[PDB]
């Protein structure tokens, strides 16, 4: 089988810059009689199927802008993106169709660099619906931040919590190149009712000092009831 090796596993590039990635094959994809290279490039944006970009190593698909350029010959190939745009975020794949089985490179992930953006931090107490079922999930949201690195610490009555939370991070946004992140703390109902202060503390490069959002157990009331308290 022909082994495809894509050299930069991931790269970060700023909007407007120019970047290149390489695809090396274990055998020549060039057919002498043809003097064509049987190679294709695909772009796979988050949540989507791969999209054909380049074939015959350097022919663009209909609709592919000129800033995508494939080059190389034989066993050495290159995809170049110039005038990088935010929507160029994707995994780029090469594919040989010289021999069977058809084989693909393992992908080059292209991430967009931008200016620092501090997260907006939001906290959500558990619902009465969930508490009735025996569990309390407390959710801390970090919204629309850059870079991806961030630290979330749960404190319950000033005790640091560890091992009882899970984080999830979105793919980079295709318009503003930011990330969002959730951290979910899970306790039994019995454990939840034993404590008062629930706090999410966030550390991030865009925050000159850490940000804490918190609530006290029971301090929230269903919407509509406030006419009885105001």
């Amino acid at each position: 089988d022909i082994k495809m090796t894509q050299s930069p596993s991931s790269l970060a590039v700023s909007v407007g810059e120019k970047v290149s990635m390489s695809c090396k094959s274990s055998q020549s994809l060039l057919y002498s009689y043809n003097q064509k290279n049987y190679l294709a490039w695909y772009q796979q944006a988050p949540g989507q199927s791969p999209k054909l970009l380049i074939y015959w190593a350097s022919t663009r698909e209909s609709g592919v802008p000129d800033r995508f350029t494939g080059s190389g010959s034989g066993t050495d190939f290159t995809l170049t993106i110039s005038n990088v745009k935010t929507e160029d975020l994707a995994v780029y794949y090469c594919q040989q169709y010289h021999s069977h089985p058809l084989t693909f490179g393992q992908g080059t992930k292209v991430e967009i660099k931008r200016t620092v953006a501090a997260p907006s931090v939001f906290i959500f107490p558990p619902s009465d619906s969930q508490l009735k079922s025996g569990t309390a999930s407390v959710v801390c949201l970090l919204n629309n931040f850059y870079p991806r690195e961030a630290k979330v610490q749960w404190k319950v009555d000033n005790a640091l919590q560890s091992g009882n939370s899970q984080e999830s991070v979105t793919e980079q946004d295709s318009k503003d190149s930011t990330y969002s992140l959730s951290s979910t703390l899970t306790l039994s109902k019995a454990d939840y009712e034993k404590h008062k202060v629930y706090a999410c503390e966030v550390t991030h490069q865009g925050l000159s000092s850490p940000v804490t959002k918190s609530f006290n157990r029971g301090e929230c009331s269903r919407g509509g009831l406030e006419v009885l308290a105001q």
Partner: protein, 219 residues
């Protein structure tokens, strides 16, 4: 041409995976290689094989004698069958139309190989309040907890609300069930007057839930 995939997203180990690709806009007898490709967790992409316009096949030797690709010309469908599956066959499966290069791709079918039983999610509100309001922006959402297998889809207001939505990748909990949240930021001045409903669909369990998310007062 349009390629529309269907078939179950959960298969028990040692059983058979069967998927269907429905083609419109082009007859599968007129030309091309009607091709199955799969993408593993971790992004490796593998060519599985094809049936061509004449009904003949070629397969990846890595799939030994486990694979069959067939067709039904009267329905303009072609099919994947993969026998004796294991966790190594958990992947997203794409039907495609190829001619060396692969120009057209289906939407993809997530297939999980597991003995675990299907389970529909519970949906809980992430209620907007002062604790989730910054400036004139409030965040709200839905927690979609304890389902199996992937995937779930989440829309807001039946798809009328898309701006500012973040539907997080699911995480597998220590219980072996998935959970995710979907959140959205909206004008805090809309909380009195705009209804917000998250529409959750878990096709593997035939579970559909609409959850109205109403504000809370926190002080």
């Amino acid at each position: 041409v349009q390629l529309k995939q269907s078939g179950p997203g959960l298969v028990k180990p040692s059983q058979s995976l069967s998927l269907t690709c429905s083609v419109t806009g082009y007859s599968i007898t007129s030309g091309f290689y009607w091709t199955w490709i799969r993408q593993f967790p971790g992004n490796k992409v593998e060519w599985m094989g094809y049936i061509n316009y004449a009904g003949n096949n070629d397969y990846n030797p890595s799939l030994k004698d486990r694979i069959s690709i067939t067709r039904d010309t009267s329905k303009n469908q072609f099919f994947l069958k993969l026998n004796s599956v294991t966790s190594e066959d958990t992947a997203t499966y794409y039907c495609t139309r190829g001619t060396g290069r692969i120009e057209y791709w289906g939407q993809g079918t997530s297939v999980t190989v597991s003995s675990a039983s299907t389970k529909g999610p519970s949906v809980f509100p992430l209620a907007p309040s002062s604790k989730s309001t910054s400036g004139g922006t409030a965040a709200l959402g839905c927690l979609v907890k304890d389902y199996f297998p992937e995937p779930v889809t989440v829309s807001w207001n039946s798809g009328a609300l898309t701006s500012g939505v973040h539907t997080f990748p699911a995480v597998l909990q220590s219980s072996g069930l998935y959970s995710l949240s979907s959140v959205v930021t909206v004008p805090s001045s809309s909380l009195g007057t705009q209804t917000y409903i998250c529409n959750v669909n878990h096709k593997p369990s035939n579970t559909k839930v609409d959850k109205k998310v109403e504000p809370k007062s926190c002080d």
